[PDB]
Design a protein around this motif. Structure first.
Motif, PDB file in Angstrom:
ATOM      1  N   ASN B  53       0.811  -1.208   0.000  1.00  0.00           N
ATOM      2  CA  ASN B  53       0.000   0.000   0.000  1.00  0.00           C
ATOM      3  C   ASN B  53       0.847   1.262   0.000  1.00  0.00           C
ATOM      4  O   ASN B  53       0.291   2.364   0.003  1.00  0.00           O
ATOM      5  N   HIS B  54       2.172   1.119   0.008  1.00  0.00           N
ATOM      6  CA  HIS B  54       3.105   2.246  -0.009  1.00  0.00           C
ATOM      7  C   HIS B  54       2.877   3.174   1.177  1.00  0.00           C
ATOM      8  O   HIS B  54       3.030   4.392   1.078  1.00  0.00           O
ATOM      9  N   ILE B  55       2.507   2.588   2.313  1.00  0.00           N
ATOM     10  CA  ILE B  55       2.441   3.315   3.578  1.00  0.00           C
ATOM     11  C   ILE B  55       3.848   3.242   4.163  1.00  0.00           C
ATOM     12  O   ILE B  55       4.191   2.324   4.905  1.00  0.00           O
ATOM     13  N   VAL B  56       4.680   4.216   3.807  1.00  0.00           N
ATOM     14  CA  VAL B  56       6.077   4.225   4.208  1.00  0.00           C
ATOM     15  C   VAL B  56       6.347   5.465   5.047  1.00  0.00           C
ATOM     16  O   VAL B  56       5.630   6.465   4.978  1.00  0.00           O
ATOM     17  N   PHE B  57       7.397   5.379   5.857  1.00  0.00           N
ATOM     18  CA  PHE B  57       7.840   6.529   6.626  1.00  0.00           C
ATOM     19  C   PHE B  57       8.473   7.565   5.708  1.00  0.00           C
ATOM     20  O   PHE B  57       9.034   7.241   4.659  1.00  0.00           O
ATOM     21  N   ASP B  58       8.375   8.823   6.110  1.00  0.00           N
ATOM     22  CA  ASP B  58       8.951   9.927   5.356  1.00  0.00           C
ATOM     23  C   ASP B  58      10.309  10.264   5.953  1.00  0.00           C
ATOM     24  O   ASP B  58      10.401  10.616   7.133  1.00  0.00           O
ATOM     25  N   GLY B  59      11.351  10.150   5.148  1.00  0.00           N
ATOM     26  CA  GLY B  59      12.689  10.449   5.593  1.00  0.00           C
ATOM     27  C   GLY B  59      13.664   9.432   5.056  1.00  0.00           C
ATOM     28  O   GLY B  59      13.414   8.785   4.042  1.00  0.00           O
ATOM     29  N   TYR B  60      14.784   9.297   5.756  1.00  0.00           N
ATOM     30  CA  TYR B  60      15.864   8.402   5.368  1.00  0.00           C
ATOM     31  C   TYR B  60      15.992   7.290   6.396  1.00  0.00           C
ATOM     32  O   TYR B  60      16.110   7.562   7.595  1.00  0.00           O
ATOM     33  N   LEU B  61      15.960   6.042   5.929  1.00  0.00           N
ATOM     34  CA  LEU B  61      16.265   4.923   6.810  1.00  0.00           C
ATOM     35  C   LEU B  61      17.717   4.964   7.258  1.00  0.00           C
ATOM     36  O   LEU B  61      18.020   4.733   8.433  1.00  0.00           O
ATOM     37  N   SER B  62      18.629   5.265   6.336  1.00  0.00           N
ATOM     38  CA  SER B  62      20.057   5.329   6.630  1.00  0.00           C
ATOM     39  C   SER B  62      20.650   6.505   5.877  1.00  0.00           C
ATOM     40  O   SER B  62      21.082   6.370   4.726  1.00  0.00           O
ATOM     41  N   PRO B  63      20.681   7.687   6.496  1.00  0.00           N
ATOM     42  CA  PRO B  63      21.223   8.862   5.799  1.00  0.00           C
ATOM     43  C   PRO B  63      22.661   8.692   5.354  1.00  0.00           C
ATOM     44  O   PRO B  63      23.044   9.242   4.314  1.00  0.00           O
ATOM     45  N   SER B  64      23.472   7.949   6.107  1.00  0.00           N
ATOM     46  CA  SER B  64      24.846   7.705   5.685  1.00  0.00           C
ATOM     47  C   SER B  64      24.889   6.923   4.380  1.00  0.00           C
ATOM     48  O   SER B  64      25.740   7.181   3.521  1.00  0.00           O
ATOM     49  N   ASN B  65      23.984   5.965   4.214  1.00  0.00           N
ATOM     50  CA  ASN B  65      23.868   5.206   2.977  1.00  0.00           C
ATOM     51  C   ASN B  65      23.023   5.914   1.930  1.00  0.00           C
ATOM     52  O   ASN B  65      22.864   5.383   0.827  1.00  0.00           O
ATOM     53  N   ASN B  66      22.480   7.090   2.249  1.00  0.00           N
ATOM     54  CA  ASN B  66      21.600   7.830   1.347  1.00  0.00           C
ATOM     55  C   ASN B  66      20.425   6.958   0.911  1.00  0.00           C
ATOM     56  O   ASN B  66      20.041   6.921  -0.257  1.00  0.00           O
ATOM     57  N   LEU B  67      19.854   6.245   1.875  1.00  0.00           N
ATOM     58  CA  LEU B  67      18.814   5.252   1.626  1.00  0.00           C
ATOM     59  C   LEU B  67      17.519   5.739   2.265  1.00  0.00           C
ATOM     60  O   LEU B  67      17.384   5.731   3.492  1.00  0.00           O
ATOM     61  N   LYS B  68      16.572   6.162   1.436  1.00  0.00           N
ATOM     62  CA  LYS B  68      15.281   6.594   1.940  1.00  0.00           C
ATOM     63  C   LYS B  68      14.403   5.389   2.250  1.00  0.00           C
ATOM     64  O   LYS B  68      14.657   4.269   1.802  1.00  0.00           O
ATOM     65  N   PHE B  69      13.355   5.629   3.038  1.00  0.00           N
ATOM     66  CA  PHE B  69      12.391   4.571   3.314  1.00  0.00           C
ATOM     67  C   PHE B  69      11.682   4.132   2.043  1.00  0.00           C
ATOM     68  O   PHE B  69      11.426   2.939   1.846  1.00  0.00           O
ATOM     69  N   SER B  70      11.350   5.081   1.166  1.00  0.00           N
ATOM     70  CA  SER B  70      10.665   4.741  -0.073  1.00  0.00           C
ATOM     71  C   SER B  70      11.554   3.969  -1.036  1.00  0.00           C
ATOM     72  O   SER B  70      11.035   3.345  -1.966  1.00  0.00           O
ATOM     73  N   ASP B  71      12.872   3.999  -0.843  1.00  0.00           N
ATOM     74  CA  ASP B  71      13.767   3.227  -1.694  1.00  0.00           C
ATOM     75  C   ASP B  71      13.740   1.740  -1.377  1.00  0.00           C
ATOM     76  O   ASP B  71      14.157   0.936  -2.216  1.00  0.00           O
ATOM     77  N   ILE B  72      13.269   1.360  -0.198  1.00  0.00           N
ATOM     78  CA  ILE B  72      13.238  -0.056   0.178  1.00  0.00           C
ATOM     79  C   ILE B  72      12.148  -0.761  -0.620  1.00  0.00           C
ATOM     80  O   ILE B  72      10.985  -0.325  -0.588  1.00  0.00           O
ATOM     81  N   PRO B  73      12.465  -1.827  -1.351  1.00  0.00           N
ATOM     82  CA  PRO B  73      11.427  -2.530  -2.112  1.00  0.00           C
ATOM     83  C   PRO B  73      10.371  -3.124  -1.194  1.00  0.00           C
ATOM     84  O   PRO B  73      10.648  -3.518  -0.061  1.00  0.00           O
ATOM     85  N   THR B  74       9.142  -3.176  -1.699  1.00  0.00           N
ATOM     86  CA  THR B  74       8.013  -3.661  -0.918  1.00  0.00           C
ATOM     87  C   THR B  74       7.857  -5.174  -0.965  1.00  0.00           C
ATOM     88  O   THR B  74       6.983  -5.710  -0.275  1.00  0.00           O
ATOM     89  N   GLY B  75       8.672  -5.872  -1.741  1.00  0.00           N
ATOM     90  CA  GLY B  75       8.601  -7.310  -1.870  1.00  0.00           C
ATOM     91  C   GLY B  75       9.538  -8.024  -0.919  1.00  0.00           C
ATOM     92  O   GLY B  75       9.869  -7.521   0.160  1.00  0.00           O
ATOM     93  N   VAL B  76       9.978  -9.216  -1.327  1.00  0.00           N
ATOM     94  CA  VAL B  76      10.851 -10.027  -0.486  1.00  0.00           C
ATOM     95  C   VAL B  76      12.257  -9.461  -0.363  1.00  0.00           C
ATOM     96  O   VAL B  76      13.022  -9.920   0.490  1.00  0.00           O
ATOM     97  N   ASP B  77      12.620  -8.485  -1.189  1.00  0.00           N
ATOM     98  CA  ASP B  77      13.942  -7.877  -1.136  1.00  0.00           C
ATOM     99  C   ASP B  77      14.023  -6.723  -0.147  1.00  0.00           C
ATOM    100  O   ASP B  77      15.101  -6.139   0.014  1.00  0.00           O
ATOM    101  N   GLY B  78      12.917  -6.385   0.514  1.00  0.00           N
ATOM    102  CA  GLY B  78      12.933  -5.253   1.425  1.00  0.00           C
ATOM    103  C   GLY B  78      13.883  -5.452   2.587  1.00  0.00           C
ATOM    104  O   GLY B  78      14.665  -4.563   2.925  1.00  0.00           O
TER     105      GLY B  78
END
Ligand code: CLA
Ligand code: CLA
Ligand code: CLA
Ligand code: CLA
Ligand code: CLA
Ligand code: CLA
Ligand code: CLA
Ligand code: KC2
Ligand code: KC2
Ligand code: KC2
Ligand code: KC2
Lengths: 170, 170, 170, 170
Positions: B53-78
């Motif tokens: 449903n793309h109910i994701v947090f707003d921001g960065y999961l890992s700012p050092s890795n430049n990895l936003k929450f929305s960048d995390i795949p919603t499937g088994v690779d999340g």
């Protein structure tokens, strides 16, 4: 049953300086103080978490002082930024509370509000909930002390500390 | 009363391979395992439904890795996309949980939290709720297995599978 | 205690055609039918109120049919606008419900869910709540019949009838 | 146990006119009147607080009169602003309530709804909740009288009084 409260795993009856048996008559007020500090520190920790998420009211805290809610710092200086009249109002309201509505002189800490309005009939469930309150209060005491110390030493609020990636002290 | 739990219509006592009577002493831990898997799978199914449903947090999961929450795949690779330090933190927190707070070695699965905080006094209502937990856990186990298998065989997450009209295998 | 349910002021035991004493054995299924209709009509009335407030889902009900949720009329034609496959899915799901999960053959209407999950221990409170359910079901039956009849006669849905000021029949 | 209700610290049994012993038979209806006024005044105070925060419905209260909800003043003139037909509808609905559903003739004020739907089994908790209702009703009576008097004397609604900094009478 009060002397059995706060005894939880893994420490059990944790009295490293041995004051439960040395001063058995002082335990009632000592547990009253511990519970009061736990409640206050839990409220303070929730407050800090709310502040550093910038969940602030919209408008002016003191229009005469031209002081908006967003102008109040989210760190330890927030209470200092409040106008003196506002601090006086807070102090008067909590004097009324602490002397009349939920007196601090009531050492059992039972002011009739119960847990979300209802008494816990099951003795095991009630004991577990009271232990939860005590342990969360202890954790919140340590947490609020750590938050204040970290802010005072680093020089940044929790939001500024996290946003700058200054989590690691070294 | 634990051996009566999970016996529900239309199957009743469903032991196709006959292990209730063959290994009567292993049922306690087998039901502990079943309940643990049911809870884990229910959480996992809710998680997949939230993800797609793309109910994701707003921001960065890992700012050092430049990895936003929305960048995390919603499937088994999340879970594979999370940084190794984040996986370490999750593992440490759940080690604390599974070893201290709600130990997995407690086979009855009763950690004192009850059903929404309160113990169910009525034996019939309590048995019904426990059967509901077990049946929902079984359904969620089958569902999470089906979701993972369908994603791995179609190559698309649930959102991508549904949005493309690829819900018909033939 | 079922024959005492539904007897409420100001009518008391209201049997104008005298079927409580004429057919005492049929009352169980007649009350089952009344309760079933009351629940269905309460759900239907809430549904109509939701529809005519245009509280609709965002997206497509049937992307293959290019049919958005907002395209479904809010009046009596809404169920007719649904694609045949969707009606088949609804019918299959409610066949499963009405035959397995909450069978219609259970005339007491007690499926173990209670009132918001909990049994009502106090007999007076339970009787009052059951009377509330019955009276609200009767009111909702009359209301849904009135809504459908008014829409059919006026040619307008409830939203169109209210928005045009056509509430007064004369 | 009704004559013990409303006796709370710091005043205890506060009867300066001495009407508890002078007219012992009138206390039932006097407490009924006090409770009715308390409930009405609590609702009124919540209403004023909602009004002066400009939490209003979006749309037209009376499209024939071209009267939007936001056009209704938030002060004491709000009830005077709404059309006569709307006042008639409100009066009819509350006639139905006060004569049939929750009759004012029921002096105990117990209409079967309980406190949030449930009877309070613990006599101490029930007595405390009833005392809370009475004291909050008394406070709300004084508050609504003060609000109306301040508005009629200053000439401004609560929102206008606060927004202009006219809170201090001198
Ligand atoms: C118990 C410790 C504590 C202390 C000392 C403060 C102190 C402060 N808070 Mg605060 N707050 C707290 C707990 C605390 N809060 C909790 C537990 C919450 C969650 C409900 C909040 C939610 C909150 C908001 C939403 C806002 C403040 C704000 C403020 C500042 C202005 C005073 C004000 O309007 O308070 C208002 C106090 C409350 C709304 C709740 C107090 C309830 C107590 C614990 C009972 C001041 C620095 C304002 C500010 O300037 O932001 C920086 C502001 O907008 N606080
Ligand atoms: C209540 C639990 C608790 C928790 C979870 C933390 C967590 C943290 N503290 Mg900390 N602290 C606590 C209590 C706590 N503190 C208490 C009670 C004190 C006072 C004795 C301190 C005094 C303290 C200092 C002086 C510093 C930290 C720092 C830190 C951060 C780096 C972790 C670290 O030092 O690596 C292990 C981390 C967010 C450091 C920080 O903020 O990073 C710059 C830092 O310099 N803490
Ligand atoms: C139990 C299985 C499970 C697993 C393996 C994951 C795994 C993941 N979730 Mg997740 N989630 C779950 C259950 C699960 N979730 C449930 C039950 C909910 C509903 C509350 C959510 C709600 C949720 C949100 C809102 C978000 C994630 C996100 C994520 C990803 C980043 C990690 C994170 O921030 O977690 C956060 C975990 C939680 C907020 C809840 C975990 C609670 C557990 C079950 C206890 C990661 C792939 C983030 C992401 O990258 O989106 C794709 C994100 O924004 N999850
Ligand atoms: C828990 C219940 C459950 C439900 C509701 C579904 C539902 C679905 N599965 Mg499925 N599945 C499940 C469990 C479930 N699965 C389990 C446990 C497995 C592992 C054995 C699978 C393995 C599986 C495969 C291998 C495929 C599906 C596919 C599908 C979809 C097409 C339906 C179908 O085949 O028509 C009858 C549908 C959304 C197909 C798909 O991807 O959709 C196009 C497909 O190819 N499923
Ligand atoms: C019991 C009678 C009943 C009937 C026949 C319908 C029929 C319909 N509803 Mg509906 N609805 C109902 C009750 C009912 N509703 C109730 C009680 C609610 C409040 C939760 C809703 C909330 C609702 C929304 C929010 C939407 C519909 C929509 C629809 C239409 C498309 C089907 C759909 O997606 O359903 C969805 C059904 C539900 C979400 C709830 C059904 C729960 C049942 C009673 C159990 C269809 C005409 C959609 C539409 O096209 O709008 C015009 C739409 O967006 N309904
Ligand atoms: C359940 C209670 C209920 C309520 C509150 C209403 C309310 C209403 N009905 Mg109504 N109605 C009901 C049941 C109800 N109906 C039933 C059970 C039937 C079928 C016998 C009807 C058949 C009906 C017709 C045929 C008409 C109304 C109309 C009306 C509206 C004008 C009122 C009126 O006629 O003046 C007194 C009003 C909104 C009229 C309308 O919609 O205005 C154009 C109209 O023409 N109703
Ligand atoms: C009991 C005293 C009382 C009185 C005399 C009024 C009177 C009024 N209210 Mg009101 N209100 C009250 C309590 C009261 N309210 C409470 C307790 C709430 C909180 C739920 C509200 C919430 C409310 C809203 C949100 C709005 C009004 C509005 C209005 C005005 C138009 C009538 C209307 O639509 O009412 C509607 C009444 C309700 C929605 C709640 C009444 C529930 C009673 C107490 C039972 C009218 C001046 C409207 C207006 O013109 O705003 C200025 C408007 O938009 N009121
Ligand atoms: C403890 C909780 C609390 C309660 C229950 C409470 C109730 C009321 C009531 C109802 C009885 C009124 C009428 C009222 C009025 C004003 N309050 Mg409150 N107030 C509380 C707390 C604070 C704080 C913290 C501050 C504050 C302020 C003001 C100002 C200033 C506006 C301006 O200066 O023009 C005005 C007029 C600020 C301040 O006075 O700054 C000089 C400020 O910092 N108030 N206040
Ligand atoms: C299991 C639940 C969980 C808890 C209870 C928890 C608590 C705390 C606390 C308080 C004690 C702090 C202070 C803290 C701090 C950081 N966390 Mg947490 N964290 C949890 C989970 C994750 C995950 C999954 C990730 C993650 C991350 C980071 C980063 C990285 C920022 C950056 O790299 O600059 C920082 C600074 C990410 C990561 O480290 O990526 C390299 C990431 O993926 N965390 N974390
Ligand atoms: C009764 C409740 C109910 C449940 C529990 C339920 C569950 C599922 C599941 C999971 C098991 C899947 C996978 C699934 C899939 C699709 N549904 Mg559901 N569905 C329900 C009701 C409706 C209704 C009313 C309609 C509808 C539709 C579609 C379409 C069409 C898309 C398209 O055509 O591309 C697809 C793919 C529409 C329809 O089929 O129109 C031709 C439509 O009107 N569904 N549906
Ligand atoms: C006490 C609670 C209450 C209830 C339970 C209730 C129920 C219904 C029902 C369902 C049975 C209908 C169908 C209905 C219809 C209309 N109502 Mg209600 N109404 C209530 C209160 C008010 C108030 C306060 C006002 C008002 C109005 C109108 C108008 C005017 C529109 C127009 O003039 O075009 C119309 C058509 C306004 C008014 O009549 O102003 C002349 C107005 O001020 N209503 N009303």
């Amino acid at each position: 049953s009060e002397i059995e409260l706060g005894v939880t795993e893994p420490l059990g009856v944790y009295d490293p300086l041995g004051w439960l048996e040395s001063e058995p008559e002082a335990f009632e007020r000592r547990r009253a103080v511990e519970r009061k500090h736990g409640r206050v520190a839990m409220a303070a920790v929730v407050g800090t978490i709310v502040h550093n998420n910038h969940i602030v009211f919209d408008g002016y805290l003191s229009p005469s002082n031209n002081l908006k809610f967003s102008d109040i710092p989210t760190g330890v200086d927030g209470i200092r930024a409040i106008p003196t009249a506002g601090l006086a109002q807070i102090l008067a309201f909590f004097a009324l509370v602490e002397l009349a509505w939920m007196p601090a002189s009531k050492y059992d800490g039972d002011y009739g509000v119960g847990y979300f309005g209802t008494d816990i009939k099951d003795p095991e469930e009630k004991a577990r909930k009271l232990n939860v309150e005590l342990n969360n209060g202890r954790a919140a005491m340590m947490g609020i002390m750590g938050n204040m110390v970290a802010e005072v030493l680093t020089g940044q609020t929790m939001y500024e500390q996290y946003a700058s990636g200054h989590i690691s002290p070294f």
